[PDB]
Amino acid sequence: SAIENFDAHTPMMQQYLRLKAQHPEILLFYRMGDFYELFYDDAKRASQLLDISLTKRGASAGEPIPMAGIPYHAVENYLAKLVNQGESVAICEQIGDPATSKGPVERKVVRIVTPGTISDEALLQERQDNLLAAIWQDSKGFGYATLDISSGRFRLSEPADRETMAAELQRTNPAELLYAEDFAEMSLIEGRRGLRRRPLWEFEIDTARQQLNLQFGTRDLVGFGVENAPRGLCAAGCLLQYAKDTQRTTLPHIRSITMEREQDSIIMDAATRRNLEITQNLAGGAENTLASVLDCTVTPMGSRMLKRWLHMPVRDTRVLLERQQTIGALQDFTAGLQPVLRQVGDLERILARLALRTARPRDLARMRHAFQQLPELRAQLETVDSAPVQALREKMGEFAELRDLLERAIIDTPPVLVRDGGVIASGYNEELDEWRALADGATDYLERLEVRERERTGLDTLKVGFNAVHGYYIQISRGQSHLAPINYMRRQTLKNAERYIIPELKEYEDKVLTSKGKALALEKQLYEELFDLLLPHLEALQQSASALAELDVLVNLAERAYTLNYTCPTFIDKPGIRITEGRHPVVEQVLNEPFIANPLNLSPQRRMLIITGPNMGGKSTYMRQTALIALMAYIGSYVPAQKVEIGPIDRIFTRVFMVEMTETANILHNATEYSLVLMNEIGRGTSTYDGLSLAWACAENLANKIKALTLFATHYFELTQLPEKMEGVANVHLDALEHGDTIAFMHSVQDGAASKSYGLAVAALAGVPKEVIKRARQKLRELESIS
Amino acid sequence: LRLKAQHPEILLFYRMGDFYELFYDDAKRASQLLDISLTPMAGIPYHAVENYLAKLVNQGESVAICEQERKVVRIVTPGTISDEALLQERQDNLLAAIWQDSKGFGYATLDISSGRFRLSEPADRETMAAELQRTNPAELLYAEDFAEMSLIEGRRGLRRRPLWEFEIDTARQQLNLQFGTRDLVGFGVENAPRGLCAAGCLLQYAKDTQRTTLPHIRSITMEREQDSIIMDAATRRNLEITQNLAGGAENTLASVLDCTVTPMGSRMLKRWLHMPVRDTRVLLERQQTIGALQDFTAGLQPVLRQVGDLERILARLALRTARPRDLARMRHAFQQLPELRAQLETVDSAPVQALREKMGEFAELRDLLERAIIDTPPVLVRDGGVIASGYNEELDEWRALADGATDYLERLEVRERERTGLDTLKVGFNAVHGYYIQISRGQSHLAPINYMRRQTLKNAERYIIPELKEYEDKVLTSKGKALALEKQLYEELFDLLLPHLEALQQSASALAELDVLVNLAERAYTLNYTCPTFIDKPGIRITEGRHPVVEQVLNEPFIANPLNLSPQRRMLIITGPNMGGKSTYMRQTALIALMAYIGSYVPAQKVEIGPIDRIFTRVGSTFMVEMTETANILHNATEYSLVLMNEIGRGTSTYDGLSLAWACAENLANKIKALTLFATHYFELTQLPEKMEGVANVHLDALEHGDTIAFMHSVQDGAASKSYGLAVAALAGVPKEVIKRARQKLRELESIS
DNA sequence: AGCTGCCAGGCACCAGTG
DNA sequence: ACTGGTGCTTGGCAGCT
Numbered sequence A: 001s002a003i004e005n006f007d008a009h010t011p012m013m014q015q016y017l018r019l020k021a022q023h024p025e026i027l028l029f030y031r032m033g034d035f036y037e038l039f040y041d042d043a044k045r046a047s048q049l050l051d052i053s054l055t056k057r058g059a060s061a062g063e064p065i066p067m068a069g070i071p072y073h074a075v076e077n078y079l080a081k082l083v084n085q086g087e088s089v090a091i092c093e094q095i096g097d098p099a100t101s102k103g104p105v106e107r108k109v110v111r112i113v114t115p116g117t118i119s120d121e122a123l124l125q126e127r128q129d130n131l132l133a134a135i136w137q138d139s140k141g142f143g144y145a146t147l148d149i150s151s152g153r154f155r156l157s158e159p160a161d162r163e164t165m166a167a168e169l170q171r172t173n174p175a176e177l178l179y180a181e182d183f184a185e186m187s188l189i190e191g192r193r194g195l196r197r198r199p200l201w202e203f204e205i206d207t208a209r210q211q212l213n214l215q216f217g218t219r220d221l222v223g224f225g226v227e228n229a230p231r232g233l234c235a236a237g238c239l240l241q242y243a244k245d246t247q248r249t250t251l252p253h254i255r256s257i258t259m260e261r262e263q264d265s266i267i268m269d270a271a272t273r274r275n276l277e278i279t280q281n282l283a284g285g286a287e288n289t290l291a292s293v294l295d296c297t298v299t300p301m302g303s304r305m306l307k308r309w310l311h312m313p314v315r316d317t318r319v320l321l322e323r324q325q326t327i328g329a330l331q332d333f334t335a336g337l338q339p340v341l342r343q344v345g346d347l348e349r350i351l352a353r354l355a356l357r358t359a360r361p362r363d364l365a366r367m368r369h370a371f372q373q374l375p376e377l378r379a380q381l382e383t384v385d386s387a388p389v390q391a392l393r394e395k396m397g398e399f400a401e402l403r404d405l406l407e408r409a410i411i412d413t414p415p416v417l418v419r420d421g422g423v424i425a426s427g428y429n430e431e432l433d434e435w436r437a438l439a440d441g442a443t444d445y446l447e448r449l450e451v452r453e454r455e456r457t458g459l460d461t462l463k464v465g466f467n468a469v470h471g472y473y474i475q476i477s478r479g480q481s482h483l484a485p486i487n488y489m490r491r492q493t494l495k496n497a498e499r500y501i502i503p504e505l506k507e508y509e510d511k512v513l514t515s516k517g518k519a520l521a522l523e524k525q526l527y528e529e530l531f532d533l534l535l536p537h538l539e540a541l542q543q544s545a546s547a548l549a550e551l552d553v554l555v556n557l558a559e560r561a562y563t564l565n566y567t568c569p570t571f572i573d574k575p576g577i578r579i580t581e582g583r584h585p586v587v588e589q590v591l592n593e594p595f596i597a598n599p600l601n602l603s604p605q606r607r608m609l610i611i612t613g614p615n616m617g618g619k620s621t622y623m624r625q626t627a628l629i630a631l632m633a634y635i636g637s638y639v640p641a642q643k644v645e646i647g648p649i650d651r652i653f654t655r656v657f658m659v660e661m662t663e664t665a666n667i668l669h670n671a672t673e674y675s676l677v678l679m680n681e682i683g684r685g686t687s688t689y690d691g692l693s694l695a696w697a698c699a700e701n702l703a704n705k706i707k708a709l710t711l712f713a714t715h716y717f718e719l720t721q722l723p724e725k726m727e728g729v730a731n732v733h734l735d736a737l738e739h740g741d742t743i744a745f746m747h748s749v750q751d752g753a754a755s756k757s758y759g760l761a762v763a764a765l766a767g768v769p770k771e772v773i774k775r776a777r778q779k780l781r782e783l784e785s786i787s
Numbered sequence B: 001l002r003l004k005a006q007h008p009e010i011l012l013f014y015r016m017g018d019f020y021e022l023f024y025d026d027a028k029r030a031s032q033l034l035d036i037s038l039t040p041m042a043g044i045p046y047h048a049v050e051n052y053l054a055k056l057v058n059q060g061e062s063v064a065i066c067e068q069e070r071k072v073v074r075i076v077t078p079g080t081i082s083d084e085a086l087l088q089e090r091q092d093n094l095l096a097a098i099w100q101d102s103k104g105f106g107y108a109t110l111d112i113s114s115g116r117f118r119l120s121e122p123a124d125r126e127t128m129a130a131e132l133q134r135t136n137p138a139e140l141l142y143a144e145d146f147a148e149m150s151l152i153e154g155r156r157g158l159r160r161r162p163l164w165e166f167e168i169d170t171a172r173q174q175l176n177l178q179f180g181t182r183d184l185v186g187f188g189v190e191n192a193p194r195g196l197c198a199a200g201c202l203l204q205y206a207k208d209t210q211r212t213t214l215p216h217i218r219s220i221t222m223e224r225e226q227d228s229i230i231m232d233a234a235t236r237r238n239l240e241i242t243q244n245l246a247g248g249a250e251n252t253l254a255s256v257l258d259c260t261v262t263p264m265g266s267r268m269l270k271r272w273l274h275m276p277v278r279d280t281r282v283l284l285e286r287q288q289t290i291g292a293l294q295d296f297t298a299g300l301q302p303v304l305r306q307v308g309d310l311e312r313i314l315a316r317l318a319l320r321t322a323r324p325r326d327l328a329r330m331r332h333a334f335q336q337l338p339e340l341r342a343q344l345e346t347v348d349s350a351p352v353q354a355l356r357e358k359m360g361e362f363a364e365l366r367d368l369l370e371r372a373i374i375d376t377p378p379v380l381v382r383d384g385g386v387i388a389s390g391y392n393e394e395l396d397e398w399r400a401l402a403d404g405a406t407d408y409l410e411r412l413e414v415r416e417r418e419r420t421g422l423d424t425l426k427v428g429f430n431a432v433h434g435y436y437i438q439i440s441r442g443q444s445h446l447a448p449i450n451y452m453r454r455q456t457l458k459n460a461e462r463y464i465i466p467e468l469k470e471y472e473d474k475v476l477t478s479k480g481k482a483l484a485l486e487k488q489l490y491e492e493l494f495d496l497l498l499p500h501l502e503a504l505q506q507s508a509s510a511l512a513e514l515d516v517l518v519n520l521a522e523r524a525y526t527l528n529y530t531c532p533t534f535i536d537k538p539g540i541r542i543t544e545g546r547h548p549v550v551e552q553v554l555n556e557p558f559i560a561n562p563l564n565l566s567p568q569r570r571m572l573i574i575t576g577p578n579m580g581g582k583s584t585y586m587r588q589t590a591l592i593a594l595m596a597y598i599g600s601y602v603p604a605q606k607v608e609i610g611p612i613d614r615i616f617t618r619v620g621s622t623f624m625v626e627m628t629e630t631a632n633i634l635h636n637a638t639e640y641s642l643v644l645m646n647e648i649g650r651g652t653s654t655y656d657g658l659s660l661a662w663a664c665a666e667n668l669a670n671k672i673k674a675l676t677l678f679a680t681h682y683f684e685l686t687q688l689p690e691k692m693e694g695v696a697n698v699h700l701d702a703l704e705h706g707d708t709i710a711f712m713h714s715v716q717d718g719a720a721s722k723s724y725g726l727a728v729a730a731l732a733g734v735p736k737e738v739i740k741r742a743r744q745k746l747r748e749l750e751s752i753s
Numbered sequence C: 001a002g003c004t005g006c007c008a009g010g011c012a013c014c015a016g017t018g
Numbered sequence D: 001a002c003t004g005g006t007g008c009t010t011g012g013c014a015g016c017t
Ligand SMILES: Nc1ncnc2c1ncn2[C@@H]1O[C@H](COP(=O)(O)OP(=O)(O)O)[C@@H](O)[C@H]1O
Pocket: A587, A591, A594, A595, A596, A597, A598, A613, A614, A615, A616, A617, A618, A619, A620, A621, A622, A734, A747, A748, B621
């Protein structure tokens, strides 16, 4: 309706609309003195989201402007509300001085708070990573980049197909996801939280390289091993531009980037991560997962590292051997190291706020406290004989000098904010504790002026006091007020009292507030100056936090191994899995009855097992424990068995309609002889035998061509004939015994096909009427007479 | 501390500042329930406390409120709230009590707002389980010696009660007292002891939560098994009646049938959907109404909408908690009745005219509320400005006095301003100082000497003078007497309205049902439904039937299908692809039966249908679950049952599964004789019709064209003669060579039989 | 311990007097 | 153009009880 041309707007709205256009789709907090305000649809939304009153800002020429707002000092509680809902918010501040500005004071968006770029402790989860990610798709593949803005961890990868792209998204589970406007495979990302559509130009390869190299201080990206990963570079370039625009400061903690090559780790598809319940159970909870058993780390950063390891098993033999050695060597040390490591806390995220220059007084306080743990940690670790632990000990560093700085600079228990001062300890700066000496030391004066004037006037109600609004005063009761000296200058009247000012008290008032201002400005400048002193050491600090997190992980793994009775696995050259008395690491902890340990023997000659046995026999658990044991071995952990020898695993596949078949094909197209394939219940055709026929042909392809290590749980008794027909296939089964009426589930794996199929017995157990089980048994004997 | 001891299993909201606060386990729990920070301590903003009580009670938590020294002044329990803010408009909220004899079960539910009070005596566990699912109580009372804890243990709002709260003699005495009856014969529950024990407990608990008479609870009804189509939880969930498999409400039967215009209508329609009645007399009557009201829905619905949730408004009347906009909405509802009475006048239908009469008019009550209350009264009566001028002479007098006093002060402002020549001069008001004369700081030194200064502001001075305080008393005493008067006249409205509560409850009930029937009429017109007919023996004959939801939700053409079931053609074996077409065909059969049996029109060109005692589905250890559901069908289905089964036998060996499907089919066809759609992949089962009377084959087929396959949804006679797994494997990308081997294997496996 | 309402500091608005 | 009063969010807290 109203024509909103430039000249139709007040200078305020011209300024505002100009800043708002700079972020058309996200809420804009617009600083107006003591309030952050919103206008138009921002006001309406904010009013709905934050439960604040929708009001109006009058207009002489035009429509009234919808309006909402909150006091500047309350902004964090509200940012919490918004980012907790996936909402970005641009934060706009007053840069200019109102007193020296004819028009509206200069304003700027200084920061944009988005779900994947938060670094404030209030807004994060301690034991969970919170990543920003960018995704890109061209004609022949995907590019993908993640950034942990709190740690600087910057990763790049190029999933070759849709299936690995999906798996990658599920693993990294970004809180915010930037995607190019021309992204075609939307089914992969639509309905993820934190979606952000971006213009194609943010993905341009040349700017990506220019910007990254600028960020890293490099001439090219060769040394980062990403110089030839253009798909990935396009996503990384977009991600980095987003990070810079949201923070609008230097990001010195983002100092390198690393490519995630497929050969470096065990690739797990979407269904495997979920079926193994690694960090999430099948109902979306965190209870009864692999992490819930293994993660007894003591620092938040360690908890997160462990979870990353578990989702990303490494295939580097030397790394694994080194972690294994570390776990052995530290086992008798865990009790003493853990209480100390605990006191280090989340050094990694504190350092993020250091690099971002947003660190608050308690952040530095906690940084100090961590530094104070280092010598003790150094002392405990000197004794331990193993190279890797000494490597970590060196990397942990010591920062006695920085520790001393923080001990001299900041009081024992600082306030939350530096905004009001009382953060910089006395003795640190001669000028400061001398402004305080004024602003504060002369508060004795008020007390004595009171008794002096009270005795001099003889008015016993006389009190000296202070009021933010009216300033310092001498107060007399209304009853006595007619008796006051005539050079008492009335300052403030109340119902039952009069308040006055005299020249002496007025001078003190200017003295106090001038020097109070001095102290606080100078204190803020000293606090900022601590950033200048700490920052030069950022790189060694991050190394330290990294060392400390890895120590937390390895120490915890040593304690788990001991307490849960785990063994060190050994690595063989050829594909294979030899397990003696293996257990399911989660199920054995959950069950309140004994877990039946089981063997496994897989080799290039015995590479596929057809697993039979009843429903509830333990086929699924057996297949899962196999993959968990492999996974654990490949993060350097000890494993829940009496002994394990394991060859290399390139990838773990899981398959347990169009969807079954499409997943099956994916195995058939991508599995290799180094793959572990776990399969169940495949073969749901439309008739009696079409499904089973596909299962048979798919198995044959896995046994004869692909040659993957394959555990194939099935109830199709026809498939127990496979070993007869093709090389590399053998039968095993989960033992069960029938005692008259019932069926006993032994949970023990035995060579050979099951003696029989127990569909009828399991049906009976479920309660199917006995007359019907009886007629079914009669039908079964007919079918079995074909043999 | 000590106040928490009074109520141990109830969260304590502790009044402390501008907030309430919970500590320890209460802070722990509250934080994980309300997405709120845990410092142990947690806080709630006073302005939005009701927004939190609603969330906590929705999750089954009672909340105790400890105001100001201090004591528990308010308690809300999930099953006994009646405030609008705490309820959801279109969902019933029930209190239930559950009891187990060394004989059978006892169950009772109460809608505390409508007063709808139901009793039943489920005979076995499954039936009791079904009852819980259907009724989904927000709060559930149970005896301490309750044996079948597995029925209830997972539920929200569990309330463990002493066994003595479940005694027959005191339950009777209490129930009789409540109803003002000598015995319960007139309610048809006099000899339903187990039911009565449950109702006894429930009613005591509800009385205890309110500490008020509950006059709107004047009746109780027994639910007998032969009265409705029984559905177990799986069947209920599988039919996505009001809840879809996801847990939501989109793409459900209600989501398509429910375009009612009042919240009470929506809630009542939903009860109907979950309780199909077997009494054709009621159905015929509902059908006739839907037919007679077809042409009228257009004019009726805008009017019915204005009636609103008169049902929950009347609860607040009965509990004496009704607020002014509650009375104005009742007024508004009253103002619709003559128009509704006039529209329904010509409708030649005895059920419609019964509704018209039972709807009433209350012209005297309408007129009262028009004279008593202003057009749009404030939310609370607390601050007055509720009672309309002209209603009470005395009231008008106190307001006129208050008004002359305030006019004088307005004129005082003017007189004092002109007289002093200070253009900032104003008269104002606040609590601390009452009436005052304000002058800006810059002018305050020109204040006239008679001005007594009382309050300095940053940029203004405030003064009093005798004249100001004189008319202050005038304003305040009159305005005081007027406010006290409003409150009495307001209470008096409850006294004049309450005697008509019974009639008023019948009226909101009539109005609710009209919303439902009129809506079903519009539905039947808009979605091209037809009126089913009822036959005496089991049978289901459908001409061109469709699935009520699929046809609306999916923007593809829906393919309609016949069905012919009778005692001579009791079971259909259904082969061919199951890519949704078999399941849909089976579910639409159930849904059509359900709709017929709530009196709705149904989506077909013609439906004749016999009596149905129960509808079972087994569609969509998995095998262990499927067999457990199969078992329940085989133990409980009769020849009046509709049994729908998909592909049992999956999840075990070919031969065990076939043997089980075969034996199950035989038992259904020959022993039970239920009307059964038996969907299967077993081609071997298509041999049943030769060996067995009353069984026949039908199948779905597909068509292969272009670079795809079109899965037809047309049900045709005979067994399927193709399988499609290989065609699917190929579309899905399974390598050509692999499918070729599968083809050879397939022929080899099939040709043996 | 309340409960009421001023104030915070931006900018625009408006009515009077140039 | 000046002058000097008004208004608008929410949270802290003085100034009354
Ligand atoms: N090795 C074992 N020892 C003891 N109990 C087991 C073992 N393996 C499985 N179970 C238990 O038996 C149940 C059936 O196991 P599952 O693997 O689901 O059976 P299947 O997949 O063969 O039907 C599981 O709930 C599990 O708790």
